[PDB]
Structures are given as C-alpha cells and as structure tokens.
Amino acid sequence: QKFNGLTVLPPLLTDEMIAQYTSALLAGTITSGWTFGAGPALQIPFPMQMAYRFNGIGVTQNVLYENQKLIANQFNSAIGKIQDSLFSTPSALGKLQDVVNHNAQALNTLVKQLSSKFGAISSVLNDILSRLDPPEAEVQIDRLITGRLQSLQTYVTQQLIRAAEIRASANLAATKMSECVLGQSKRVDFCGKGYHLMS
Amino acid sequence: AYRFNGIGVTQNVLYENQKLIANQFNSAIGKIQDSLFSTPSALGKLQDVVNHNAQALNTLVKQLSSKFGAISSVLNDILSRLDPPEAEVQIDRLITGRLQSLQTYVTQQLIRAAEIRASANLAATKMSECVLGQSKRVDFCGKGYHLMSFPQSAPHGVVFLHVTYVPAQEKNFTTAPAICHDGKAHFPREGVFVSNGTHWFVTQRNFYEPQIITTDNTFVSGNCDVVIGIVNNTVYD
Amino acid sequence: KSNKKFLPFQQFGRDIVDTTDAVRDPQTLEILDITPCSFGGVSVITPGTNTSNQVAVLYQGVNCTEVSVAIHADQLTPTWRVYSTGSNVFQTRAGCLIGAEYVNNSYECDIPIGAGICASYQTQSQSIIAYTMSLGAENSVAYSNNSIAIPTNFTISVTTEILPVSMTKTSVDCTMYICGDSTECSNLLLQYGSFCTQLKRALTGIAVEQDKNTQEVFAQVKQIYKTPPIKYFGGFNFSQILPDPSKPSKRSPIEDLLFNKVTLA
Amino acid sequence: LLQYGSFCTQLKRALTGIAVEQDKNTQEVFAQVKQIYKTPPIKYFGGFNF
Ligand SMILES: *[C@@H]1O[C@H](CO)[C@@H](O[C@@H]2O[C@H](CO)[C@@H](O)[C@H](O)[C@H]2NC(C)=O)[C@H](O)[C@H]1NC(C)=O
Ligand SMILES: *[C@@H]1O[C@H](CO)[C@@H](O[C@@H]2O[C@H](CO)[C@@H](O)[C@H](O)[C@H]2NC(C)=O)[C@H](O)[C@H]1NC(C)=O
Ligand SMILES: *[C@@H]1O[C@H](CO)[C@@H](O[C@@H]2O[C@H](CO)[C@@H](O)[C@H](O)[C@H]2NC(C)=O)[C@H](O)[C@H]1NC(C)=O
Ligand SMILES: *[C@@H]1O[C@H](CO)[C@@H](O)[C@H](O)[C@H]1NC(C)=O
Ligand SMILES: *[C@@H]1O[C@H](CO)[C@@H](O)[C@H](O)[C@H]1NC(C)=O
Ligand SMILES: *[C@@H]1O[C@H](CO)[C@@H](O)[C@H](O)[C@H]1NC(C)=O
Ligand SMILES: *[C@@H]1O[C@H](CO)[C@@H](O)[C@H](O)[C@H]1NC(C)=O
Ligand SMILES: *[C@@H]1O[C@H](CO)[C@@H](O)[C@H](O)[C@H]1NC(C)=O
Ligand SMILES: *[C@@H]1O[C@H](CO)[C@@H](O)[C@H](O)[C@H]1NC(C)=O
Numbered sequence: 001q002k003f004n005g006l007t008v009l010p011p012l013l014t015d016e017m018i019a020q021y022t023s024a025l026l027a028g029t030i031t032s033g034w035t036f037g038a039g040p041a042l043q044i045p046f047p048m049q050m051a052y053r054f055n056g057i058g059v060t061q062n063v064l065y066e067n068q069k070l071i072a073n074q075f076n077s078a079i080g081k082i083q084d085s086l087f088s089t090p091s092a093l094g095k096l097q098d099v100v101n102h103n104a105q106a107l108n109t110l111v112k113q114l115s116s117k118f119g120a121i122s123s124v125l126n127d128i129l130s131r132l133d134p135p136e137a138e139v140q141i142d143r144l145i146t147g148r149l150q151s152l153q154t155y156v157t158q159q160l161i162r163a164a165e166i167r168a169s170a171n172l173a174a175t176k177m178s179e180c181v182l183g184q185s186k187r188v189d190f191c192g193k194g195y196h197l198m199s
Numbered sequence: 200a201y202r203f204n205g206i207g208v209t210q211n212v213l214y215e216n217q218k219l220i221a222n223q224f225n226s227a228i229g230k231i232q233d234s235l236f237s238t239p240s241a242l243g244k245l246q247d248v249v250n251h252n253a254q255a256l257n258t259l260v261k262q263l264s265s266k267f268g269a270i271s272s273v274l275n276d277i278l279s280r281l282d283p284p285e286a287e288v289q290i291d292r293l294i295t296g297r298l299q300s301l302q303t304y305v306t307q308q309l310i311r312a313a314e315i316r317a318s319a320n321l322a323a324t325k326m327s328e329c330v331l332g333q334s335k336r337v338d339f340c341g342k343g344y345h346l347m348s349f350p351q352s353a354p355h356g357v358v359f360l361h362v363t364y365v366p367a368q369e370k371n372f373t374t375a376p377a378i379c380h381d382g383k384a385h386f387p388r389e390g391v392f393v394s395n396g397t398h399w400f401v402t403q404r405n406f407y408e409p410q411i412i413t414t415d416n417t418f419v420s421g422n423c424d425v426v427i428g429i430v431n432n433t434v435y436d
Numbered sequence: 437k438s439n440k441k442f443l444p445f446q447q448f449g450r451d452i453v454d455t456t457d458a459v460r461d462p463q464t465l466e467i468l469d470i471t472p473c474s475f476g477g478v479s480v481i482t483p484g485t486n487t488s489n490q491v492a493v494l495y496q497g498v499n500c501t502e503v504s505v506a507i508h509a510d511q512l513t514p515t516w517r518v519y520s521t522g523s524n525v526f527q528t529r530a531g532c533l534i535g536a537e538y539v540n541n542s543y544e545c546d547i548p549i550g551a552g553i554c555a556s557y558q559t560q561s562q563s564i565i566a567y568t569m570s571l572g573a574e575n576s577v578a579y580s581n582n583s584i585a586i587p588t589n590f591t592i593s594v595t596t597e598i599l600p601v602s603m604t605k606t607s608v609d610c611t612m613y614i615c616g617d618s619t620e621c622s623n624l625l626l627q628y629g630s631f632c633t634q635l636k637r638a639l640t641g642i643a644v645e646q647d648k649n650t651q652e653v654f655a656q657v658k659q660i661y662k663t664p665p666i667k668y669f670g671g672f673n674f675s676q677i678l679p680d681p682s683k684p685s686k687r688s689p690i691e692d693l694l695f696n697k698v699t700l701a
Numbered sequence: 702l703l704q705y706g707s708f709c710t711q712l713k714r715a716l717t718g719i720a721v722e723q724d725k726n727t728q729e730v731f732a733q734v735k736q737i738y739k740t741p742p743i744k745y746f747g748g749f750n751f
C-alpha cells in the first residue's frame with residue numbers, strides 16, 4: 001500500500017536487457033568457442049570445437065568424429081529432460097524464493113511495529129495531541145520515538161548483514177560465468193559433476 | 200619461451216620475434232605511468248576506505264553535543280548548578296544516548312572489517328597464483344592469455360600489473376576434419392588442417408604457420424567411410 | 437466510493453497491517469474508502485558546477501498529471517518549481533522527470549536514472565538529455581561449417597588491478613568518552629554491567645586482524661632476493677618497477693606516483 | 702526528534718550504499734562481453750539442437 005515512508009526503487013537494467021546479454025553470450029560461445037573471451041571472435045565449425053574439448057579432457061578426436069551422431073542424440077535427449085525435471089519439482093527454485101520471502105517478512109514486521117504502545121496511553125499521535133496539553137504530551141511522545149528508532153535500527157542492521165551474503169553469492173556467480181562459460185575448466189566439481197565440456 | 204609454450208605457442212615464435220616482443224612490452228609499460236598519472240578516479244577503491252573511516256569518526260565525535268532530552272549537554276554545569284538528588288535524572292539520559300552511539304559505531308566497524316578481510320583473502324590468492332606461477336583460470340590474472348604479473352605496494356593496498364598475450368590480424372580459411380589417403384583416414388597430431396584455396400597444410404592453432412602434411416605429424420586410426428566431411432588428398436611419407 | 441459489504445453492525449475497516457482504510461458516514465449510511473495523499477522522494481540530476489548550473493528534477497514513484505495538477509493548485513510542499521516547458525516533461529517507470537529533453541538515440545550510460553533510462557549533458561546549445569541506455573556495438577560472426585579463422589600476429593598488453601588490504605586501527609576509552617572525568621557519572625555508569633569490556637574486546641580483535649591481513653598478503657617469501665648489478669635481460673626494461681636508489685625511501689617511480697596520488701585530528 | 706542527533710543521516714547512507722551495490726552486482730555478473738553477437742539465420746550445427 002506504499003506503506004508509511006517506505007518505497008521500492010526499480011533496478012537499472014530491465015529484464016529485456018539481461019535477456020539480450022544472455023543471448024549474446026550464447027551466440028558467442030556457439031559460433032566461436034572460447035576465442036571471443038580473450039580477443040576477437042574467430043569462427044570454427046561446431047564438431048571441430050567439440051573435438052577440441054574432447055582433446056582437452058584427455059580423449060582423442062577420432063572418438064568424437066566416429067560417434068558424432070550418438071553424441072548428438074545423447075545431448076538432445078539430455079537437454080529435453082531438463083525442462084520436464086524443472087517443470088514438475090516443487091522445491092526447485094527455493095534459493096530464489098527465499099530472498100523474496102525474507103524481504104517481504106522484514107518489511108511486514110517493520111510496518112506492523114507501528115501499532116505498539118511502548119508503555120504509552122495510545123499508539124496514535126493525533127489523539128495524544130488532541131486530548132493533552134503541550135507540557136504533558138511530550139512525556140508520551142518520547143516513548144514512541146524511542147521504540148520506533150529502535151525498530152528502524154534493527155531493520156537496517158539486518159539488511160546490511162543480508163546484503164553481505166548476497167554480494168558473496170554474486171561474486172561466486174561472476175567467477176563461474178568467467179571460468180565455465182568463457183572457457184573449459186579443470187577444477188574438480190566446479191562446473192558440474194564429471195569431466196567438464198561446456199556451460 | 201617457457202611461458203609461450205605454457206599458453207600453447209611454440210618457442211621459435213618468440214626466438215624469432217624477440218626484438219618486437221621486447222619493444223611492445225617496453226611501450227606497454229611506458230603507457231601505464233601516463234594512464235595512472237592523468238585519471239581522477241583511478242584509486243577510488245583505496246580512497247573510499249579512508250573517507251569512510253574519517254566520516255565514522257567525525258560522526259562519533261559530533262554526537263557529543265546532543266542533549267537527548269536533558270537541560271544541557273555539558274556535565275560540568277549540570278553538576279555545578281544542581282544538587283546530587285536531581286543531577287542523576289539528567290546524567291542518565293546522556294549516559295543512555297552516548298552508550299547507544301558507541302554501540303552503533305562498533306557494530307558498523309565489525310561489519311566493515313569483515314569485507315576488508317574478504318578483499319585481503321582474494322589479494323593473497325592472486326599473489327600466490329598470478330605472481331608465483333602461471334595461471335590457466337580465465338580472467339583471473341587479466342584479460343587475455345596470462346603470461347606473468349608484477350606487484351606494487353600502495354597505501355593500504357596492492358596493485359597488480361598483468362601481462363597478457365592477445366591475437367591479432369586474423370585470416371579466413373577452408374578446413375576439414377580428416378584427410379583420406381589410400382583408403383585410410385588421417386587426423387592431425389596437434390593442429391588443424393587448412394587450405395589456402397588450392398593446397399592443404401597443417402598449422403598450429405593460435406598462430407599461422409603452414410607445414411607439409413606428412414606421416415610424422417598425423418596418425419591414421421581408422422577408415423575412410425565413417426567421418427562426415429572427409430577430404431581426400433595426398434600424404435607424403 | 438467503496439464496494440465493501442459491511443455487515444449492519446460494523447463501523448470501521450482494517451487491513452493486514454492493521455490500519456484504517458474504510459469508514460461509514462454517520463448521517464448517511466455509506467461506505468467510504470480512505471487513501472493517503474501522495475508523497476515521495478525528490479532527486480536532483482546535475483553535471484558538475486565546473487560545467488554548468490542547469491539541473492533536472494525527478495519526482496519518484498508518481499504520475500506526471502498529479503504533479504502538474506498539484507502545481508497548478510499550489511499544493512506541493514517544495515516551494516521552488518522548475519519552468520516546466522511543454523516539451524521537457526517525461527514519464528518513466530521511476531517517476532516524473534522535469535527539465536530534460538528525451539531523444540531517441542542510444543549512448544553509453546552517463547548518469548543512471550531508472551529502468552534503462554540515463555541522462556547526459558550534450559551540445560546537440562548545451563542542454564540535458566535523457567535516453568535509453570545502449571548495451572554495445574552489434575556484431576555477427578560469419579559462421580559456416582567448413583570455414584575457420586586463424587590469427588597471424590599478436591599484441592603484448594599490460595593492465596592494472598587495485599585491491600584494498602587493511603584499514604585503520606582505533607581504540608576507544610569508555611569512561612573518558614561518556615563521563616569525561618566526573619566521579620558521579622562513573623558511579624552511575626558502573627550500574628550498567630559490562631558493555632565496555634565487550635566493546636574493548638571487539639576493537640582489539642579488529643586491530644589484530646588488520647595486522648594479520650598485511651602479514652598474509654605480503655610475507656609470502658622467506659628469502660630476501662637481490663637483482664644483479666648489471667641490468668640486462670635480453671632487451672626487456674624493468675626500470676619503472678625496480679627500486680630507485682637515488683631517493684631515500686628506495687621506491688620505484690610507479691610506487692612514488694601511487695603514494696603521491698592518495699591524500700589522507 | 703531533532704534533539705537526538707544524526708541517526709537518520711546514517712540510516713539513509715546505509716540504505717543508499719546497499720542499493721548501489723545491488724546494481725553493481727548485476728553489472729558485474731552479466732555485462733561480461735562488449736559486443737552483441739548474433740546467431741546465423743540457418744540453425745544447423747552438425748546435428749546439435751539448441
Ligand atoms: C605484426 O605487428 C607489428 C606491430 O604493428 C608489425 O610491426 C610494425 O610493422 C609496420 C609495417 O612495417 C611498421 O610501420 C611498424 O613500425 C612496426 N611496429 C613495430 C613496433 O616495429 C609487424 O610487421 C606485424 N607482422 C606482420 C607479419 O604483419
Ligand atoms: C629503460 O627505460 C627508461 C625509461 O624510459 C630509460 O630512461 C630514459 O633514457 C633516456 C635516454 O637515456 C632519457 O632521455 C630519459 O630521460 C630516461 N628516462 C628516465 C625516466 O630516466 C632507460 O634508458 C631504459 N634503459 C635502457 C637500457 O635503454
Ligand atoms: C529441435 O528440438 C525441437 C524441440 O524438441 C524440435 O521441435 C519439435 O519438432 C517436432 C517435429 O517437427 C514437433 O512435433 C514438436 O512439436 C516440436 N517441439 C516444439 C516445442 O516446438 C525441433 O524440430 C528440433 N529441430 C530439428 C531440426 O529437428
Ligand atoms: C572470411 O570470409 C568471410 C566470408 O566472406 C567473411 O565474412 C570474413 O570477414 C572473412 N574474414 C576476414 C578476416 O576477412
Ligand atoms: C597456395 O599455396 C600454394 C603452395 O605453394 C601456392 O602455390 C599457391 O599459389 C597458393 N595460393 C594462393 C591463392 O595463395
Ligand atoms: C576422393 O574425393 C572425391 C570428391 O569427394 C570423390 O568423388 C572420390 O570418390 C574420392 N576418392 C575415392 C577413392 O573414393
Ligand atoms: C439525521 O441524519 C440522518 C442521516 O442522513 C437522516 O436520515 C435523518 O433524517 C436526519 N434527521 C434529522 C432530524 O436531522
Ligand atoms: C498517468 O497520466 C496519463 C496522462 O494523462 C494517463 O493517461 C494515465 O492513465 C495516468 N496513470 C496513472 C496511474 O495515474
Ligand atoms: C525515435 O526512433 C524513430 C526515429 O525515426 C521513431 O520511429 C521513434 O518514434 C522515435 N521516438 C520518439 C520520437 O519518441
């Protein structure tokens with residue numbers, strides 16, 4: 001309801017722009033391999049890039065050149081199963097839902113904290129002002145002031161502590177984007193389980 | 200030469216372009232001083248720490264002139280113009296306000312120290328992996344193919360100079376996955392089959408250097424009726 | 437007017453946050469919805485004062501018709517008002533923007549505003565313009581299934597990275613800060629327990645960690661290695677990063693520039 | 702409330718810093734490349750289906 005002095009600001013990048021960035025990354029990695037992450041993009045046919053990657057994990061090229069059709073079929077089926085796996089699993093995106101839930105909960109608590117009395121006659125300033133004289137109203141107003149200041153301080157400290165963790169997660173995601181999408185990784189279990197090919 | 204071999208280029212390239220490589224390195228080092236000398240927001244990361252610390256200290260000191268709902272913000276006059284039974288009713292409010300100020304300052308300092316520690320851990324990892332060795336992680340020690348790095352010290356921080364190799368002046372070619380000869384398929388040992396329009400060579404991947412196709416730089420391992428896109432030519436023994 | 441089905445015995449109406457949102461008129465039984473009057477934040481967009489004195493104003497989270505109506509009736513609290521030409525008011529998802537002319541070119545972002553909108557100072561005379569941010573140059577790679585591209589030359593490039601390591605170590609005395617040198621204040625403060633011991637412990641831990649950070653980053657090696665007196669390395673020149681013996685502090689030229697570039701009771 | 706000092710300036714500074722960092726996170730993760738690459742009109746890649 002726009003709350004009481006609380007507002008939400010829109011992010012600088014819209015969803016379309018993020019989709020455009022993702023599309024550019026996909027096109028680059030499909031038509032160039034890993035060359036475009038280190039300089040100008042150099043074209044190469046896709047089966048030859050797959051041969052390069054098999055050579056990178058320790059297998060010779062003739063294996064792929066002789067099992068090309070089988071490898072393509074396996075890749076197609078594996079991609080096809082992902083949509084079904086994500087389509088019918090309830091707790092699939094709990095990590096992304098937790099952020100929204102926590103933010104909504106914190107805002108709701110902050111708003112609800114406005115109906116407390118903190119040991120005063122009323123939680124409304126208007127009636128305190130309309131039924132008391134100035135020398136006696138401040139003795140009630142200051143208690144509300146102290147309580148509401150404490151509520152704001154608690155909210156801000158919690159927000160800072162959550163922002164630190166979000167930043168750590170974003171740093172990890174950026175490292176993964178650099179090392180698993182723009183190249184082929186040799187670190188174990190960093191870009192999936194098995195011998196990494198691409199992402 | 201060892202480092203060029205580490206990024207996938209043979210040694211003769213450096214041994215034949217030594218003077219050019221040295222000149223390029225000298226010019227690149229020369230430009231860094233000018234780039235840092237005439238850029239205003241170059242060291243904002245190091246300046247932000249100083250600014251934040253000074254701001255926090257100034258706020259803490261300035262918080263001492265508040266009244267917190269008392270007659271005065273000075274203890275001396277409160278003590279000099281009131282009797283003991285009535286002075287504590289004013290002193291306790293100042294006590295509570297100043298305690299709250301100290302608590303806020305300390306919590307903020309802890310939260311900032313955590314982030315500084317994370318940054319220092321990252322810097323130590325970079326010092327180990329980019330200065331004491333050659334790295335293969337992409338975009339960890341600069342943009343390009345990593346060669347080496349040099350450290351320099353700065354107030355409250357460190358500066359890394361990364362040296363990288365970047366390809367240039369590309370050309371387009373016709374390629375094939377294998378060569379058919381005498382009913383046998385041939386794949387390159389390391390490199391790629393390339394064609395300039397009429398003749399076929401084998402070259403290394405990151406630098407154009409055509410060679411004659413021979414049984415010394417290929418292996419047979421198969422037949423000619425399975426590979427898709429195979430091109431048939433001659434292989435000299 | 438309200439469309440709430442009040443049972444014949446209620447008077448007020450609340451919501452989840454527990455604030456009044458509906459009421460009944462005593463003299464004529466009728467349900468009235470109550471909505472708060474418009475409020476929000478104000479942002480000021482300016483280039484440097486070295487450049488010009490023109491500004492633009494953003495009213496956050498509001499439609500432009502309401503701000504125009506409030507201005508015409510003189511009901512808006514910030515008394516100052518921008519000239520509001522008929523062609524320099526724009527509506528964005530961040531709010532109402534007054535004082536900038538919207539063009540339909542795309543540039544790199546200069547001053548962020550909102551959902552993809554940026555502002556800049558352009559000579560087009562000089563003025564402030566608003567536009568949609570550009571993501572980059574368009575490129576398409578010539579993909580084919582028998583064509584490859586191979587480089588024929590190279591470049592040696594050098595780049596920089598700056599990282600913070602440590603911060604300032606400070607200490608605070610409780611009694612001096614809170615009570616000065618008053619004995620009555622100290623006796624009163626003694627009744628609050630042991631907050632000051634915790635404060636001292638926290639600050640001391642921070643200082644020790646500050647020293648440990650620098651130790652971990654810089655004390656990598658165990659030997660002090662020295663470079664030979666003759667500085668010939670096959671044509672490579674390291675003079676800009678090696679220590680300079682003429683000056684007293686024995687720093688490289690780049691280190692001197694860095695230490696003079698940072699400005700600090 | 703004016704008698705309590707400057708807690709509100711600190712609160713505003715903290716929230717503003719949080720918001721700016723929120724924008725910087727997305728910028729660092731997603732704006733990796735400098736060119737906008739496009740895929741060819743004919744989508745044949747040797748039997749792989751994207
Ligand atoms: C690879 O690039 C270098 C750097 O541009 C080329 O060297 C330049 O060549 C031009 C043409 O003769 C000269 O005008 C420049 O003075 C050279 N630069 C330097 C630093 O010496 C080099 O010729 C290129 N190699 C090839 C095979 O084209
Ligand atoms: C290594 O580089 C430095 C810096 O460019 C060279 O020092 C310059 O030398 C020239 C010619 O002697 C002088 O005109 C400049 O004033 C020097 N610059 C500075 C900052 O002193 C140095 O000569 C180079 N090393 C070699 C062996 O040539
Ligand atoms: C790539 O995969 C998609 C998805 O499986 C294929 O699209 C399907 O094509 C069949 C036959 O034309 C249709 O019956 C399905 O309804 C399509 N699915 C969807 C979601 O549209 C597509 O044909 C494949 N590409 C090629 C070249 O075969
Ligand atoms: C190679 O030829 C293709 C097809 O015309 C062209 O698009 C590409 O730009 C060429 N490569 C170079 C480096 O000129
Ligand atoms: C391709 O290389 C062969 C080998 O020497 C040469 O004879 C021929 O002229 C070259 N063709 C072109 C177009 O450069
Ligand atoms: C060599 O290649 C040509 C063209 O693809 C083909 O017609 C011919 O049959 C091949 N040689 C043999 C012995 O099959
Ligand atoms: C009092 O107000 C009610 C509400 O409109 C009205 O129905 C009624 O006729 C009024 N009676 C008198 C005496 O004013
Ligand atoms: C904002 O103003 C425009 C211009 O009159 C109007 O068409 C639109 O309905 C308004 N929207 C809101 C939410 O007030
Ligand atoms: C800007 O882009 C083109 C210019 O020809 C036009 O179609 C579009 O409507 C313009 N946007 C405006 C005028 O707001």
Ligand SMILES: *[C@@H]1O[C@H](CO)[C@@H](O)[C@H](O)[C@H]1NC(C)=O
Pocket residue numbers: 579580581743745
């Ligand atoms: C790729 O090969 C197919 C053969 O199935 C051919 O029709 C197509 O033209 C080739 N791609 C291009 C860009 O020519």
